[model samples]
Target chain A: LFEGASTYPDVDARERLNNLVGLDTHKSRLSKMLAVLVNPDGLSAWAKKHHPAAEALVKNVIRRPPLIVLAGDVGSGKTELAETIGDDVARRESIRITLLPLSEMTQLISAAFEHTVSEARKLARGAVILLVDEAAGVNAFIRGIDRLGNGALPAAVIMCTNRVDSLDPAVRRRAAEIITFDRPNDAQRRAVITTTLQGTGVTGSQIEGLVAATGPADYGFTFSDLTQRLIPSIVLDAYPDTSINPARALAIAQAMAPTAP
Target chain B: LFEGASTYPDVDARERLNNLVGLDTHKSRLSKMLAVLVNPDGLSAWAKKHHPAAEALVKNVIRRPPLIVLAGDVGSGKTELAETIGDDVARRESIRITLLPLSEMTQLISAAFEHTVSEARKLARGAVILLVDEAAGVNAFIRGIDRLGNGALPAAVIMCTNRVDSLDPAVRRRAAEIITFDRPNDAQRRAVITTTLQGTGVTGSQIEGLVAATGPADYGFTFSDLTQRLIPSIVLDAYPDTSINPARALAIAQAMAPTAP
Candidate 1:
């Protein structure tokens, strides 16, 4: 039922994960969450060894549903994180993993949906991670997850939503974890802008000035705003005719409005 | 996106509806149910003019979800009835109608599902009928209907299932009407067999013998068992070698076991 390459190439997934800047906290948390899902036995052994007195509690935690809700503003790194986390989990667990995106998962008939997951289990030598973007709108996907229940499929679900409030109460309650994301802060914006313009000969002072322009005290740009909108606009504006420079970059940054949170 | 012809041909739909034997009661009930959904204004006008005392009650009934559940044993004409009833309603209301089967409806993505329905609203020229077969298995289709709610799509849904007990309680509760089907009775079997063997020169006494053989006191054949199984078996058993005769037909009828109801 899954037509194309089911699993993302490990190298490409790793590169994408590495390139995604300023989500260290998110990445660390996601890595732990996925570790429990992908290598539960390993975690169980470790927990037993390290915290013998709390063995029952650890067991209960391990039995919880492997469902995580990544709620955040649009253009934040929720989807990007979901897309690439499987590689991290795979590398850490030393096993193959498949990332089944929402579009592919919910587009098939119910029987096909089950077949897709069953097939992914075989393809994913270790585990499958279902990456659901825009989680609020698709009731079919939610109901399918409910039908399968916890540990029914050898897969964990990560649902990314711009509006968490819109999700059904039952789905919200089922999540084992809920991580919220906000627009990138000034420091995060600086890191993103600096990393993106590394080879462009933009000076340190110039980078600082542009970052300030993009993110004032009252408002700021999302990670996508800086990478997709602001940087692309700046480059295109000064390409061919004018040489890229600090003043022009700063001017373009000031002229553009960041997407509303 | 619907690829081939969206709406069933009115002539063929009507012929199939007429050919469906022993469902006169079902046809009458479905006709009244569809009348309220397709021509609500007409019903409201008549109600106000004739039964002015019950105007509010009639309005409430008119506003309920336009969903019908056709529950029956396998091959007992639930789906066959669902497939053709739109033509009956179409002719009675003098309007164009479309019959969208479950296979086409649940196989689409949610966005595509909405688009398909929106497009059907335009192509329908009057109304659309979503005929869901094996309703218990397709949670996606059920959820899609739940999302649309009452009067959302210019369509009425007819869900056919062999086991209504397997359906979600919410879905069972939401149905505006539930019509039950049973295996064809002795008289219906006689009517079907006689009508089917009309050109074969089979005598009336032979038809009665065959009917009695098919529907014994302890058990009976479904409508499809007679039409699709027994009759075909009898025809194929003596094809090309011997002329169709009452003796051979009676022998085949006794030899064949009717499908379990």
Candidate 2:
């Protein structure tokens, strides 16, 4: 069941998460949650030192299920965050974290879950993070999470979904935290465009014009729209013949359609 | 480039092709096309015996580009037929055939093409079948097929697509044959239903009732709808405790919505 696992402090995953624009709050919250999960004794010690009166509350929070729901629009970076956030957790806590993305295990049965739980117990020496993308339809996975919760493995499950409303009620109830990601606003879109166009000789004024063209009023570009679709179109349009310039960049940006939200 | 190639007379692929319902005309045409492709000398010999007057026309047809386009609906067994059709070609010709599905080679370049062409020259002792699924968006693959055409290797390229109109005109122009697959008609759907429910204790009359219920007037089950969706839904709805019976099967068929064509 853990055959498809990737070891964390993974350089590529960290690079991807770092390249993602915005979602600083989501990252911070996820890091804290994972840190508490991996080292509850450390959190309890901190709580006792900082706020002795709230030690009981901190202990109760630590005992709760280790499930996080990251729900948002498509291309909003939920899965990216879930995948790479373990790097931060591993660094801060100084413990190795194994991340297993539940892509191939969607159709897994109860026996597979039982085997995974048993193996996870053996691997309790190191922490585990199960990343489930498109989690709404994975009813078997949610049931497996219940087994994980009851078994007390040193692991956490992060389920990411575009449609949080479609998730089973039991899944929602088990979630220790739910973080919602939204489409990037105009400011965020500008940051995305600016970062992606860096070293491509696209001027700041041209980028500003592109930001206006791709704003919510015109075609509301998501994070992926700016990075994957719009920028790539500009490069493809000017490739091999003409160098990209302010006029050509703005023209491509205006002519292109952002993916529908 | 042929590292991911699967050998033809492949057991699993042959099984899948045999299980596909209907498409008898498609199978016949594809078999004949592949036969002529692998053994053009055999066809020329046949033409000499039967239609000596059309020998020039037959030779002209054989000399044309070895590209066939299978354009059709999403689940109409286009790729399945393309994958396994080479088995018949190999068997009848007493030759080995290599089937390399181009799922992974979409982003391949001119250098890869040169290499593949050179390697294919070495493998000319055997024949090759290159199967390209979702051919509309694969511009590089079409260019590679142009190289394959010019190189005169003992190979055939079968490109399958759901959107034929979206394909480049050059691709359509190069096609030696174009086959279209349609949604299964009512009689075809009956065959699909009867074959799928053969040993499930579902009576023949109940299958006939299901045939009428899933006709074009009703939910309009596709080839895949009967095999993948509707039947699977029935099994899932009656799993573990309930035994599959005529009543349960019909009830599930009526309740479940067939995938939209």
RMSD of 1: 27.0
lDDT tens string, model 2, B141-225? 5677777767658777788877678688878888888988766787787776666555455677887888877776644765545
Determine which window of 10 residues in candidate 2 chain B has minimal summed lDDT.
B232-241
What DockQ was computed for model 1? 0.01
lDDT of 2 by residue, A1-261 (tens): 433677877788778778877666567667767666655676556545544453123433455467777776777788778878988787767778878766534555454566556656877357887776654224576568766776667788888888655665446545655565655666667787777778888778788888888876743776677777887787787787987677877888788777875
The TM-scores of all predictions, comma-separated, are 0.44, 0.49
Candidate 1: CAPRI quality band? incorrect
Whole-model lDDT per candidate: 0.66, 0.67
Model 1 TM-score (2 dp): 0.44
Clashes (backbone N, CA, C under 3 Å), per candidate, total 0, 0
Off by over 4 Å in 2: A1-261, B50-61, B103-109, B134-143, B150-152
Worst-scoring 10-residue span by lDDT in model 1 chain B: B232-241
lDDT of 2: 0.67
Candidate 1 lDDT over residue span A121-192, tens digit each = 575257777766654224455555654444445567788887656665445545545555667766777888
Residue A161 lDDT in model 2? 81
